[PDB]
């Protein structure tokens, strides 16, 4: 049993405005202190300066975890439940808390110890009768808002903390769900010997009955500390009583808001209670934990990258483009050299626009969950990036491989096993090379509407210079095809279906320079392959360096 | 002065579950009655059955506006402020309330009477110090959440009602903004002689002090009616007192929730208070108001259809496609008959995909505001549809007319005034004909993600059968080009730049059937024009019949 006594002595916090000034108190092992105050009084700045997420020059004052300063050994026993709940919406409640248990608990334990620690906090917080329910956010409909907060508390109870610092847990709940939530926070402060500190926004009449001690901030100058049942007995002494039946938490916020008065209760506290508050004061251990962090992060996000890959409005978009492409070029003749190349350029526009546009929403949408979880240990951005690289290498190759299996034998392309699997290999390498353009642009620009416009303009300049629409490019724009991804896929597709124009010039008898300039071209088959590999790796190295630059 | 005495006698409401059963009471002229209860108790069903938005077979009971039944003459003096605020986010507070004043007040008045009635409710509700601030929703940042509710109350105060029925106005506010809001609802019930009925979710200690009468529902059986200051004096008689200092609104909801008990207070009310509650119980007048409803609705939504037309991420998407199209075909030669026709088919793909995709979000996003305002009189869906037709005829023609003015003289298209204005006329007629495909699809499918997929699949089958990519269409798919919008714009552009292939076959000397099949084609210039007009009108008649079918 390691309990924490906590004492902050005269904490100040300016920002460039004074938010906190002279806040002093103590929090004991085994008490449930609630921090009351109006909005903009400095409640949430006091919780961040106590949990340890704020230190520097803007802060001023001694914050003492068990008579000593805050070192990083204490932060493993200190939890902070922030105001917003960032959970993946397709995992169940048991799946959410088991993946967090493997990632957060140390690797000295077995996989059965770290699995029984995740089904103990399910029974502690009362999540047993929803443990197979999907979490959901607003569209993947799941657990309630009062059980979404209990999952976010269970993230911080898996490491068994001694000081649990919550930041407005009862905001947005009922009067019943917000009473039962405080009934459990009072449970694991009187039975577990913990030290719970919270900040309630507007307590009801019997939520306020459950507080051991109350700290009341006016606009950053600490009107009252002490017990909750002795709150209005102190204000009767200075001469402030309610004139009608009030909730005692309503009467306190009306003193801190100027409706009853602020300066008269600063000088009353500073001479009567603020005096005596001072009186009680390797290559198999560096590598194996990366490949286990990767293996859990890849198995966790399989369900996330399954509804953003096999969306039923994206399967329909590829089923429709297979039937249309399969009907317009149905039983096509390879001696029509102009329509066979417009088929192979439709495959290059469709499978460069569709992967690069969908990949640009991947990193903006997970910036908040990655920031909260990387700062909490739990991974190191290179096992997070390499689980998004590998997790979308596997899922994004099922729809282009089913487009081509359908529309290769109906369209009468080049018959055989080796012409089929060379066309399939070039199409899958082009989907992965163009997907990384969307990853590198969505990570450099962490907005998703500002980056869907730059990947639209880039894919339009890639298609216009890709080899088919314009044949007489002006002399100052012939360089732009060499940076184009579409130019190297389309030159490879024509080289598989036609070769070096030898059989087609015999059958056409044109050996009329139409088929010498469109089927042979400029780049070889190995220069075209080795630039689609340089754009595979190179557009994912640029997406990693973009994500280092954010700080998150 | 026309005041309303309101008495509901034994209102029941089943749904196929009993929501209301035996609710009886009276509301007097000049009292501010608040309706209390837990969530799911039938508060919001009682307000809709009293304002008049619920009547039929599911309802049972006599609802009497001033000793008589509810006729539609009384509903002009009855206002209902619903729970969610549906305001256009680019109008200022004065602009919002003046357009509502012209549309709601009768046409007997002048434009200065209906303008001074809109600056009287600004001063009444205390909106004078934000009357030039933009409203905004979350992105167009504007007035606060406590002033967004005061605009929604001012919509219903413009018709000068006698019974104002609000539905949870203080939800999502502060403790200060939700006290000042009740201080004005108590202002226009004690000074104006109105009859305000509201339903507060969780009142604070001094919000409850401002209620004249209180109606308390348990789960639909009316625990208490009477004064608010005599609420707990009645429950002391049956033997229910708080054991600790409570907010008196908290003690009442704990009686109605089973935490203190429900059936013991139904039989206490039914024999002590529910007895004695029975004891007090043309062609220039049909046309001119349409063309004035159209003229206000078109001037109101000019600012709405200015940020969805001149979005700065859409100006950049057309500026980039002008420079790319202007550089790849820079000083192009018209004897390159294959590259001149790929320029004229990129203009047909770009200006059919871009208007039809943006038009599909127009009607889904305004379904909630149109439903609330059409049911409230104020317009009739044919002056609303013809203000969206005409309001986007004007704004959507500025970006295609600036694309073409830039890239006609750099690209060296056909020189002259008559070749320029025939190419501009065909391009503007094609933008309006393809925009109506997005309007007809977004109105038949009132989702915006399910309809952006069907307008993607349709525009892909329009571009493949459009005439350039495939020449030898199989015999069962040649009909599909005649329903294509892209086929008729592209056949008109080639007919303006080349004519009936006479000068180009002389200069090429091929009179080699390449230029006989791609520049002359199938349809004439008048059949192509008169089908783009049939798709202009016909895709907007189908969008009107889709909007009748919704009921909204
Ligand atoms: C037939 C020849 C001339 C090729 C012409 C280009 C086509 C391949 C274009 C025409 C319309 C394009 C579509 C128009 C709109 C979009 C934007 C974007 O689609 C969405 O917004 C839906 C994505 C989602 O949210 O699921 C992704 C690409 C897509 C489907 C485009 C894919 C490529 C398409 C089919
Ligand atoms: C060069 C030849 C082969 C023509 C090929 C078709 C092009 C005209 C395509 C290629 C990519 C397409 C764009 C890809 C994505 C979209 C979806 C959609 O764009 C958006 O999602 C942004 C709209 C907005 O929200 O402002 C509207 C059409 C647009 C810009 C497409 C317009 C038509 C483009 C430029």
- HEC per residue, B364-395: HHHHHHHHHHHCCCCCCCHHHHHHHHHHHHHH
Question: A38 among the known binding-site residues?
Answer: yes
Query: Is residue A465 within 8 Å of residue A481, measured between CB atoms?
Result: yes
- Do both A18 and A155 map to the same domain? no
Distances from the Cα of A165 to the Cα of A82, A252, A408, B252, B259, angstroms: 9, 22, 61, 33, 29
- Do both A113 and A216 map to the same domain? no
Please name which of B381, B322, B393, B301 lies closest in space to residue B355, comparing C-alpha atoms: B393
Distances from the Cα of A78 to the Cα of A61, A106, A117, A300, B237, angstroms: 19, 16, 18, 26, 51
Tokens representing A204 are: 């009801």
Query: Is residue A216 within 8 Å of residue A183, measured between CB atoms?
Result: no
Residue B458's contacts (CB-CB under 8 Å, 6 or more residues apart) are: B437, B441
- Residue pointed to by tokens 């009084």: A41
- Residue pointed to by tokens 């200022």: B92
SS3 of residue A264 by DSSP: helix
- Do both B361 and B270 map to the same domain? no
Distances from the Cα of B474 to the Cα of A495, B186, B457, B465, B477, angstroms: 26, 76, 20, 11, 6
- Do both A504 and A467 map to the same domain? yes
Q: Which of A248, A453, A474 sits opposite B330 (nearest CB)?
A: A474
Site residues for ligand 2, CB cut-off 6 Å: A 349, 353, 452, 456, 459-460, 463-464, 469; B 311, 313-314, 317, 346, 349-350, 353-354, 357
Cα of first residue to Cα of last residue in chain A, in angstroms, is 36
Cα of A233 to nearest chain B Cα, Å: 12
Cα of first residue to Cα of last residue in chain B, in angstroms, is 36
CB contact under 8 A, A328 and B456: no
Q: Which of A39, A328, A470 sits opposite B464 (nearest CB)?
A: A328
Strand pairing report for A6-14 and A18-27:
antiparallel
Residue of A358, A451, A460, A464 to test ligand 2 pocket, by largest number of atoms within 8 Å of CB: A460
Tokens representing A392 are: 């979308």
Cα of A93 to nearest chain B Cα, Å: 26
Strand pairing report for B78-81 and B224-227:
unpaired
Q: Report the chain A residue with the minimal C-alpha distance to residue B344.
A: A469
DSSP annotation of A248? H
CB contact under 8 A, A205 and B250: yes
CB contact under 8 A, A39 and B473: no
CB contact under 8 A, A470 and B342: yes
Q: Report the chain B residue with the minimal C-alpha distance to residue A469.
A: B342
Burial class (CB in 10 A: 0-12, 13-18, 19+), B24: middle
Q: Determination method here?
A: cryo-EM
Please name which of B171, B123, B69, B82 lies closest in space to residue B376, comparing C-alpha atoms: B82
Q: Which of B174, B248, B460 sits opposite A245 (nearest CB)?
A: B248
Q: Report the chain B residue with the minimal C-alpha distance to residue A204.
A: B250
- Residue pointed to by tokens 């020189």: B415
- Do both B513 and B366 map to the same domain? yes
Handedness of CA B70, B71, B72, B75 (dihedral sign): negative
Cα of A521 to nearest chain B Cα, Å: 17
Give B240-302 as a DSSP string.
---SS---HHHHHHHHTTT---HHHHHHHHHHHTTTTHHHH---SSSSHHHHHHHHHHHHHTT
Choose the final residue of a domain: A160, A176, A205: A160
Which ligand is in closest contact with the Cα of A328?
A: 1
CB contact under 8 A, A449 and B313: yes
What does the alpha-carbon distance between residue A126 and residue A135 come to, in Å, rounded to a whole number? 15
Which ligand is in closest contact with the Cα of A448?
A: 2
Residue of A327, A337, A510 best to disrupt the B interface, most CBs of B under 10 A: A327
CB contact under 8 A, B313 and A453: yes
Question: A391 among the known binding-site residues?
Answer: no
Cα of A135 to nearest chain B Cα, Å: 23
CB contact under 8 A, A461 and B324: yes
Choose the final residue of a domain: B102, B137, B160: B160
Q: Which of B175, B328, B461 sits opposite A324 (nearest CB)?
A: B461
Number of residues assigned to chain B: 552
Query: Is residue A446 within 8 Å of residue A360, measured between CB atoms?
Result: no
Please name which of B311, B262, B21 lies closest in space to residue B140, comparing C-alpha atoms: B311
CB contact under 8 A, B465 and A253: no
Please name which of B310, B315, B299, B451 lies closest in space to residue B390, comparing C-alpha atoms: B299
What does the alpha-carbon distance between residue B64 and residue B50 come to, in Å, rounded to a whole number? 9
- Do both A422 and A524 map to the same domain? yes
- Do both A353 and A430 map to the same domain? yes
From chain B, pick out residues whose CB is under 8 angstroms from the CB of A307: none
Please name which of B70, B148, B76 lies closest in space to residue B105, comparing C-alpha atoms: B76
Asked if residue A354 has its Cβ within 6 Å of ligand 1, the reply is: yes
Instruction: Count other C-beta atoms under 10 Å from residue B13's C-beta.
Output: 22
Query: Is residue A11 within 8 Å of residue A46, measured between CB atoms?
Result: yes
Instruction: Count other C-beta atoms under 10 Å from residue A267's C-beta.
Output: 10
CB contact under 8 A, B206 and A244: yes
Question: A61 among the known binding-site residues?
Answer: no
What does the alpha-carbon distance between residue A75 and residue A137 come to, in Å, rounded to a whole number? 30
What does the alpha-carbon distance between residue A261 and residue B258 come to, in Å, rounded to a whole number? 39
Residue B183: give its domain's CATH number.
3.40.50.300
CB contact under 8 A, A247 and B244: no
Helix axes A451-464, A485-497, angle to 10 degrees: 40
Give B54-97 as a DSSP string.
--SSSEEEEEEETTB---TTGGGSEEEE-SS----TTSBHHHHH
What does the alpha-carbon distance between residue A510 and residue A513 come to, in Å, rounded to a whole number? 8
DSSP annotation of A239? T
The number of angstroms, rounded, from the C-alpha of A213 to the middle of its chain's C-alpha atoms is 36
CB contact under 8 A, A247 and B206: no
From chain B, pick out residues whose CB is under 8 angstroms from the CB of A242: 205
From chain B, pick out residues whose CB is under 8 angstroms from the CB of A176: 257
DSSP annotation of A298? H
Q: Which of A174, A472, A474 sits opposite B39 (nearest CB)?
A: A174
Distances from the Cα of A16 to the Cα of A56, A58, A369, angstroms: 13, 9, 28
Strand pairing report for B195-198 and B32-36:
parallel
B355 C-alpha vs ligand 1 centroid, how far in Å?
14
Query: Is residue B467 within 8 Å of residue B495, measured between CB atoms?
Result: no
Cα of B534 to nearest chain A Cα, Å: 26
Annotated binding site of B: 37-44
Which ligand is in closest contact with the Cα of A464?
A: 2
Handedness of CA A436, A438, A442, A445 (dihedral sign): positive
Query: Is residue B55 within 8 Å of residue B70, measured between CB atoms?
Result: yes
Tokens representing A280 are: 């009680």
Q: Report the chain B residue with the minimal C-alpha distance to residue A171.
A: B172
- Exposure pattern of B267-291 as b/e (b: 16+ CB <10 Å)? ebbeeeebeebeeeeeeeeeeeeee
Burial class (CB in 10 A: 0-12, 13-18, 19+), B311: middle
- Do both B473 and B523 map to the same domain? yes
- Residue pointed to by tokens 């009067």: A175
Strand pairing report for B18-27 and B6-14:
antiparallel
Distances from the Cα of B392 to the Cα of B347, B351, B388, B486, angstroms: 20, 15, 6, 20
What does the alpha-carbon distance between residue B256 and residue A143 come to, in Å, rounded to a whole number? 26
Asked if residue A243 has its Cβ within 6 Å of ligand 1, the reply is: no
Strand order in the sheet with A59-65: A18-27, A6-14, A59-65
Give A345-382 as a DSSP string.
HHHHHHHHHHHHHHGGGTTGGGHHHHHHHHTTSS--SH
Instruction: Count other C-beta atoms under 10 Å from residue B424's C-beta.
Output: 16
A439 C-alpha vs ligand 2 centroid, how far in Å?
19
A536 C-alpha vs ligand 2 centroid, how far in Å?
23
- Do both B277 and B330 map to the same domain? no
Query: Is residue B324 within 8 Å of residue B406, measured between CB atoms?
Result: no
Contacts 24+ apart (CB under 8 A), A234-239: A234/A273, A235/A265, A238/A264, A238/A265, A238/A268
What does the alpha-carbon distance between residue A423 and residue A442 come to, in Å, rounded to a whole number? 29
Choose the final residue of a domain: A125, A160, A195: A160
CB contact under 8 A, B205 and A251: yes
Give B326-348 as a DSSP string.
HHHTTT--TT-HHHHHHHHHHHH
SS3 of residue A27 by DSSP: strand
Phi, psi of A237, rounded to the nearest 5 degrees: -70, -40
What does the alpha-carbon distance between residue B458 and residue A446 come to, in Å, rounded to a whole number? 32
Which ligand is in closest contact with the Cα of A486?
A: 2
Q: Report the chain B residue with the minimal C-alpha distance to residue A252.
A: B205
Query: Is residue A136 within 8 Å of residue A142, measured between CB atoms?
Result: yes
Annotated binding site of B for ATP: 37-44
From chain B, pick out residues whose CB is under 8 angstroms from the CB of A175: 38, 202, 250, 253
- Residue pointed to by tokens 């909801």: B253
- Do both B54 and B150 map to the same domain? no
DSSP annotation of A68? B
Asked if residue B463 has its Cβ within 6 Å of ligand 1, the reply is: yes
- Do both A133 and A217 map to the same domain? no
Cα of A247 to nearest chain B Cα, Å: 4
CB contact under 8 A, A460 and B324: yes
- Do both A317 and A361 map to the same domain? yes
Tokens representing B130 are: 């934000």
Query: What is the extent of the structural domain holding A187?
Result: 1-77+168-281
How many structural domains are present in chain A?
3
B350 C-alpha vs ligand 2 centroid, how far in Å?
7
What is the experimental resolution, given in Å to one decimal place? 2.8
Q: What percent of chain A is helix, strand and coil (3-state, nearest 5)?
A: 50, 10, 40
Q: How many Cβ pairs closer than 8 A exist between chain A and B? A: 144
Which ligand is in closest contact with the Cα of A450?
A: 2
B438 C-alpha vs ligand 2 centroid, how far in Å?
15
Residue of B308, B328, B411 best to disrupt the A interface, most CBs of A under 10 A: B328
SS3 of residue A96 by DSSP: helix
SS3 of residue B20 by DSSP: strand
């Amino acid at each position: 049993c390691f309990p924490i006594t906590l004492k902050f002595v005269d904490v100040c916090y300016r920002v460039k405005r004074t938010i906190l000034s002279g806040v002093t108190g103590m929090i004991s092992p085994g008490e449930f202190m609630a921090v009351l105050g109006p909005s903009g009084s400095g409640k949430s700045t006091l919780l961040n300066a106590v949990a340890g997420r704020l230190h520097g020059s803007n802060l001023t004052g001694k914050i003492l975890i068990n008579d000593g300063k805050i070192t990083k050994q204490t932060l493993k026993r200190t939890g902070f439940v922030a105001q917003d709940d960032l959970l993946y919406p397709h995992l169940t409640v048991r799946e959410t808390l088991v993946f967090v248990a493997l990632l957060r608990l140390p690797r000295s334990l077995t996989r059965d110890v770290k699995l029984r620690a995740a089904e103990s906090v399910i029974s502690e917080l009362g999540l047993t009768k929803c443990e197979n329910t999907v979490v959901g956010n607003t569209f993947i409909r799941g657990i309630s808002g009062g059980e979404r907060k209990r999952v976010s508390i269970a993230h911080e109870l898996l490491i068994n903390p001694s000081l649990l610092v919550l930041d407005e847990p009862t905001s947005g709940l009922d009067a019943t769900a917000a009473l039962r939530l405080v009934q459990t926070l009072a449970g694991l402060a009187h039975g577990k010997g913990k030290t719970v500190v919270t900040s309630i926004h507007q307590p009801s009449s019997r939520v306020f009955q459950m507080f051991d001690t109350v700290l009341l901030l006016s606009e950053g100058k600490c009107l009252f500390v002490g017990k909750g049942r002795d709150a209005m007995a102190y204000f009767e002494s200075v001469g402030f009583s309610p004139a009608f039946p009030m909730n005692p938490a309503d009467f306190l916020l009306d003193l801190a808001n100027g409706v009853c008065v602020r300066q008269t209760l600063v000088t009353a506290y500073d001479t009567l209670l603020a005096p005596q508050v001072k009186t009680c004061i390797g290559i198999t251990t560096c590598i194996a934990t990366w490949f286990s962090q990767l293996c859990i992060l890849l198995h966790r996000l399989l369900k996330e990258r399954r509804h953003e890959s096999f969306d039923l409005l994206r399967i329909f978009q590829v089923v429709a483009a297979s039937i249309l492409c399969g009907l317009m070029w149905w039983h096509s003749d390879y001696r029509d050299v102009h329509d066979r190349l417009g088929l192979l350029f439709f495959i290059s526009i469709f499978w460069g626009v569709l992967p690069s546009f969908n990949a640009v929403f991947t990193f903006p949408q997970e910036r908040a969950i990655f920031t909260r979880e990387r700062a909490s240990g739990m991974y190191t951005l290179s096992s997070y990036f390499m689980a998004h690289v590998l997790g979308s290498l596997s899922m994004e190759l099922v729809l282009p491989a089913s487009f081509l299996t359908f529309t290769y034998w109906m369209v009468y392309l080049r018959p055989g096993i080796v012409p089929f699997l060379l066309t399939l290999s070039v199409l899958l390498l082009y989907v992965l090379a163009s997907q990384g353009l969307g990853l590198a642009l969505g990570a450099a620009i962490m907005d998703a509407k500002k980056a869907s416009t730059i990947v639209t303009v880039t894919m339009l300049a890639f298609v216009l210079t890709g080899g088919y629409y314009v044949n007489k490019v002006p002399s100052g724009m012939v360089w732009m095809k060499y940076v184009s991804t579409t130019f190297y896929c389309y030159r490879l597709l024509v080289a598989i279906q036609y070769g070096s124009g030898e059989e087609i010039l015999r059958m056409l008898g044109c050996d009329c320079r139409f088929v010498e300039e469109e089927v042979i071209g400029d780049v070889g088959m190995w220069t075209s392959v080795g630039v689609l590999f340089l754009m595979f790796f190179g557009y994912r190295v640029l997406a990693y360096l973009a994500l280092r630059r954010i700080k998150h």
